């Protein structure tokens, strides 16, 4: 049903957010090994991560 | 409602696309510092990015 | 319609999964060039990738 398909879409989105955070973590480990000017990059990652987190928790409450 | 949940799912997808582009940018900065054979990788990233962009703009028009 | 918007959301999710796998591949190529302790990272990437894959194939069957 429409409701079931919707819950599955959210679950996929939550699963991809996990993968996305794993790639962010990985990239940071790589940079650390060495641009030094990652300040803005970090800010953007943090802002969008917080954003995604709030949209997800919202969708979870909309289920 | 079904309509509200749907708009929120799209918003999460748009937010994750932003994060995804940030990780792509980051990876490129890392490679640049140094496989040289990233030609295909770049092509694939570009094709899927353009693809995702068109699906999003489409969903936005389907709202 | 609700059904069309839903199919488009899934398509965007499938397209982003492709991009996500491309960034994972890229990160691995970068690490390979050099933390050595990526064991857990690999396990997590694999578990969530398999997970995302099953949710997608499921959604495809829910269409």
d(CA B9, CA C33): 38
Copy the structure tokens of residue C34.
Answer: 């050099």
Mark A8-27 as b/e (b = at least 16 C-beta within 10 Å).
bbbbbbbbbbebbbbbbebb
> Residue B33: its chain A contacts at CB < 8 A?
34-35
Residue of A nearest to C2 (CA): A2
For residue C50, the distance in angstroms to the closest alpha carbon of chain B comes to: 19
> Residue B51: its chain C contacts at CB < 8 A?
15
Cβ atoms C25, B40 nearer than 8 A: no
- Three-state DSSP state, B22: helix
Looking at residue B62, which CATH number applies to its domain? 1.10.287.210
Identify the domain containing residue B50 by its residue range: 1-63
**Residue positions counted in chain C:** 63
| CA C38, chain centre distance (Å) | 18
For residue C61, the distance in angstroms to the closest alpha carbon of chain A comes to: 9
């Amino acid at each position: 049903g429409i409701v079931q398909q919707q819950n599955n879409l959210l679950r996929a989105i939550e699963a991809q957010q996990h993968l996305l955070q794993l790639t962010v973590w990985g990239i940071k480990q790589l940079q650390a090994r060495s641009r030094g000017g990652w300040m803005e990059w970090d800010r953007e990652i943090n802002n969008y991560t917080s954003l995604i987190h709030s949209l997800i928790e919202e969708s979870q409450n909309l289920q």
